Symmetry: D2
Subunit: 120 residues, 4 copies
């Protein structure tokens, strides 16, 4: 695809894009600590665009945190999970473009990853 790191969030109760979800991305440092990498909020389409350029998105372990609790909390639903979280290693083989899709439900959530090579 185009964006190096793309996050898409869906709402399985209303069958619509989960708009305004707090997304935070962190990067593991040499000593094992968690350093804030980037963050945003999903738009009307349930997508988050512009987290990182390929230059900035270097090889390493990443952590994407979606604040699922606030989403449900705003609608008057009390969810189970405090947050949804996806931890993964990136560009260890070579530079790839990732899409992290997540489907939300008060007591459940499933997450998938689409890895696509930018070059031939």
């Amino acid at each position: 695809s185009k964006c190096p790191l793309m996050v898409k969030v869906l709402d399985a109760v209303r069958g619509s894009p989960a708009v305004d979800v707090a997304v935070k991305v962190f990067k593991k440092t040499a000593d094992g600590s968690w350093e804030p990498f980037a963050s945003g909020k999903t738009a009307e389409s349930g997508e988050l665009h512009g987290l990182t350029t390929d230059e900035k998105f270097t090889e390493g372990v990443y952590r994407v945190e979606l604040d699922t609790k606030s989403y449900w909390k705003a609608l008057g639903i009390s969810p189970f999970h405090e947050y949804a979280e996806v931890v993964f290693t990136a560009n260890d083989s070579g530079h790839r473009h990732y899409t992290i899709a997540a489907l939300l439900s008060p007591y459940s959530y499933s997450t998938t990853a689409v890895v696509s090579n930018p070059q031939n």
Copy 2:
């Protein structure tokens, strides 16, 4: 563990097994069409064991229909699917044990097959 076929249904919105969901089993005939094989409704545990006996369950194509629409209509929710349907070929490679599991949400559902192998 005794009955070769079991249906386990869960509700993703409330964090609980889905109770009294209509489950109808259809088996494909030789002339081409389908014919009623069994029926029942999920219990308190969200399970439905005791459909058929290891003897009446012969090899062939099957169809497990779950009336998901009624289930949500009862909670004030207008779901998306008319029903969840699972079609598969059973016991082509000798006798087995299949537990089909469904995860329900108004606008989405995940179905899963679990095959057990009784020591013959």
Copy 3:
């Protein structure tokens, strides 16, 4: 300009779009029988477009059938289901645009819908 019905299919084992998944759509008729509506195959993006147009896609019960067995059998994988079927009611509340997403795995498949308005 965007078409009413869309199908997006991902592969969970490989983490990429499912290319060449055979797709068949049906429409329920007055008799309570099924009539051939459309058909196609997912492109490289794992998507399917031009299944139909706004004028042809009226109110009614539809059945999108996905040939998921051939897909796996082609890769050397022996799946469980013969195909993944999605039955739903369209253009209930007047005109709408639909998106059927299906996530594939050998013994499991998760399908979700995203209903959106063309003007809202």
Copy 4:
């Protein structure tokens, strides 16, 4: 029945329980840190029963972490996610039962919570 906390994992590629999957439960401590709580690996049934007891399992925010990466590698399969974490608040509505389920695939995973009522 007498297990306050339960974890069940399934493999979506082989269609059977995820055996020998390492589980580690943490509990947010008084000073805000994560303290070890329970550890174990999925039995043949892909589940853990001896996790904790109705008395040791008190109120608080727990963290369940499944080591999926190691599960997949020991099969020759290189997975996407580093691991699967599930963080939740427990016993906020009295002393009830908790079942955490997970459906694993190389590039995707689903989780759901089933919260029962012991004496109901």
